[PDB]
Amino acid sequence: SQIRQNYSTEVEAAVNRLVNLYLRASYTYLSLGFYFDRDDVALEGVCHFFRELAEEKREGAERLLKMQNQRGGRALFQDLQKPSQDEWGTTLDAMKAAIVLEKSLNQALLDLHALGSAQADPHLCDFLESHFLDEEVKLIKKMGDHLTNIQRLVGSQAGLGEYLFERLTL
Amino acid sequence: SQIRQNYSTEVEAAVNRLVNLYLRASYTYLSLGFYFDRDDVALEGVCHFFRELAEEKREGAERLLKMQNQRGGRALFQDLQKPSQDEWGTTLDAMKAAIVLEKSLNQALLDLHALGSAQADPHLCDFLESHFLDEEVKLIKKMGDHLTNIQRLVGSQAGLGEYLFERLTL
Amino acid sequence: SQIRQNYSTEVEAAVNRLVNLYLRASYTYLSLGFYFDRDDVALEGVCHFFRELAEEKREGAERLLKMQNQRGGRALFQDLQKPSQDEWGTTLDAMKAAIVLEKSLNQALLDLHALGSAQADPHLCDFLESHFLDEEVKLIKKMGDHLTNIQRLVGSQAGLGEYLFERLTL
Amino acid sequence: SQIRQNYSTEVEAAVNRLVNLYLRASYTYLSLGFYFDRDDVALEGVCHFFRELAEEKREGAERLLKMQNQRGGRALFQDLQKPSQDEWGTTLDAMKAAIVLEKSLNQALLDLHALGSAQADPHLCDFLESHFLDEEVKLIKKMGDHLTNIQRLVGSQAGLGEYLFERLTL
Amino acid sequence: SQIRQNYSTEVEAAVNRLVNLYLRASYTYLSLGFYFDRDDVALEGVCHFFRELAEEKREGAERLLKMQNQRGGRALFQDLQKPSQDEWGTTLDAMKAAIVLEKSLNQALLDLHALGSAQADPHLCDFLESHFLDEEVKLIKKMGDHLTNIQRLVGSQAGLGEYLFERLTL
């Protein structure tokens, strides 16, 4: 690549893999989104929360491919593994599943950051600082907040709490 | 009729009958509407949901008579049978009664569609596709959603749930 | 009924019956409306006159049910008898049929008024004065005017007169 | 009185007495209003409902005195009896107390109406029809609705229901 | 054709033929239009009715050729047969001639629809449903209405009726 400068094939492969992790998450959020939209689930606020997250993840993916091309790296796409469940249970279960997903998305970003530090790729680290690290952190505290709120409303009347959470916070 | 073309007396009679089914539904929705408006029921959101549906049904009826005249068919009106209950019970019971009504309204439309296919009346089918099939489908998923939400809020505290459903979703 | 005050079961039953008379009239005006819309009748001004009256009648009906609920009375709906003709003849015949209908609607209102006076229900009478008595009176003089005009234009050339009446007054 | 015409001293005295009944109700609604405003009651929606009713009642009073002067009658004011309770209990109790008050205000109006009919005072009856009969009827159905809603939310969790009613309907 | 998919040479030839039927109708409506514009006919409302229909028909033709190209079919144009009369008689005769034309245009569309059904060309049928079936139906009821109106005004004074129809409905 005539424009490739200080872009180790190590960081190239790691950004291809987190590109896949990000499209995989966007795929899972789509499954969650359409399950809270099921006639027998009917939590339109929860479906709307996961549909927005499926798009935020696709966009992280495109941002990472755009950056891969900018550094002269080559996008290599892998098969997208299907969501890991077909039905998500209640909003609590769905909320817990999503924050596992974001924390593993976040640990993948932290790993790429450390990889950019070993290889001394200031542009790569400055990239993950601006557009991914802060976003994941805000998203996970946001989901931890929702989880704490759903857990407090779920103690006694679950149906009522799930309805109230969907109606009052989402 | 000087303008009647490919309009079988079979589809004529079937559209007169679904015209009646549609005015009958509009009549039932009026009864439901005024029952949630009773001083001892007082669920103004539920009364407002059924008053709007009584008008959506009257308008399907007029749309069908307008189309009957456009094809040169002759409107023949029958006595409108009275709603099948005087008091509707709770919002759950009323919601379940309405979706029976919409599904039988929808099966009547599907029957007319099949009748338009046997007789090869592309204009009649294109008509029921545009203005009735999609509308019934959206309406029934909308009512299935409400039912799932009322059933989840009704498990423990029914009074509270009925109040919350009426206040938060309608 | 915890809010029912000075609302005799006599006036309750009489308002349920005039509610039916009003939905019945709205049904008849719908039949008249769709008959002047027939391809072989084609008097769009006459169809438009009777479609507007079918809605004015439905609204009297809803006004009466709204008032029945306000006084703590219970709406009881009866089967709606079908219009009393399928084809209405000429605009003259249709106009004469409508004013019979309005005058019997008006005599039903006058009867309910007398019933509200025997039982001393100032709220019921004040109600029929504001929203029905004046409306019927204006409507019947309006129809008597149309009848006098159609009869004057119908003497010699009927086709021409019917066309002119529909074109110039409706 | 040089302008007094067909204004029986019977209707004069009865309008002076309903003027007192109306200032008395306005006084009671003020007491209810300030009790839901107490730091240990704190239901600002209920306090706001009764403060608005205390003013609607004062204005009925002024309307009646204005009409008494218009007919040449003489306002005679009596001592205003104090509200009949100092603390109103819960919103349910307060709501039940208010609708007793409105129904006795309404029966006082109906009595004055009958009195205006015996003495044949068309102006007096036309007056109570326009500004009091309809208002009381709408107000009592409004309070019957609130009572039905508070009673449904009060079955199990009372604190929660009282909070929800005040937050969602008032 | 590299883009031709499921487009039978049967439907190709049938759309070329209805393209011709549509340009032929547009040609006939042009002849009718210029005949009501003749100094010795002078019915500018009737000339304006047929000039607008000559353009609506040309546009159906272009819509059909545009669709033929979209499916990869090949437009094949045939000689346009001249209108079938040079003088159209009265507005009644001209109106009757036009509705024969529209009904045969409509039966040609219904035939193409059946042809699209045998060959299972959902795109072709969905095409004729959206842009031709509904249009022809509305147009023929519109012409049946005009015919009923002209026939009613033509009974006695024909000159007067023809003038009035042209002045009041067109």
Numbering used by the authors:
A (entry chain G), B (entry chain F), C (entry chain A), D (entry chain X), E (entry chain B): 2 to 171
Question: What are the paper's exact sentences on this?
Answer:
Here we used a modified form of graphene, in conjunction with a stable grid made of gold, to control these surface effects. Functionalized graphene-on-gold grids improve the reliability of specimen preparation and enhance image quality. To address this problem we developed a method to produce multifunctional and ultrastable graphene supports with tunable surface properties for cryoEM. To demonstrate that these supports are suitable for high-resolution structure determination, we used an amylamine-functionalized graphene on gold support to determine the structure of horse spleen apoferritin.
The reconstruction reached 2.1-Å resolution (0.143 Fourier shell correlation [FSC]) from 41,202 particles with standard data collection and processing. The resolution of the reconstructed map, which is equivalent to the highest reported to date for this specimen, but required about half as many data, is demonstrated by clear densities for side chains in the map. This includes complete aspartate and glutamate residues, for which densities beyond the Cβ are often absent from EM maps. The decay rate of high-resolution information with fluence after the first 5–10 e−/Å2 of irradiation in this dataset is similar to measurements of radiation damage in 2D protein crystals. Adding a graphene layer to an all-gold support reduced particle movement by a factor of 2 during electron irradiation. Compared with graphene-on-carbon supports, graphene-on-gold supports reduced particle movement by a factor of 3. Importantly, besides reducing the rate of random (uncorrelated) particle motion, the addition of the graphene layer also reduces the movement during the first few electrons of irradiation, improving the quality (B-factor) of these initial frames, in which the molecules are less damaged by the beam. We posit that the twofold reduction in the initial movement of the particles in ice is due to the graphene layer restricting the bulk movement of the thin film of ice within each hole.
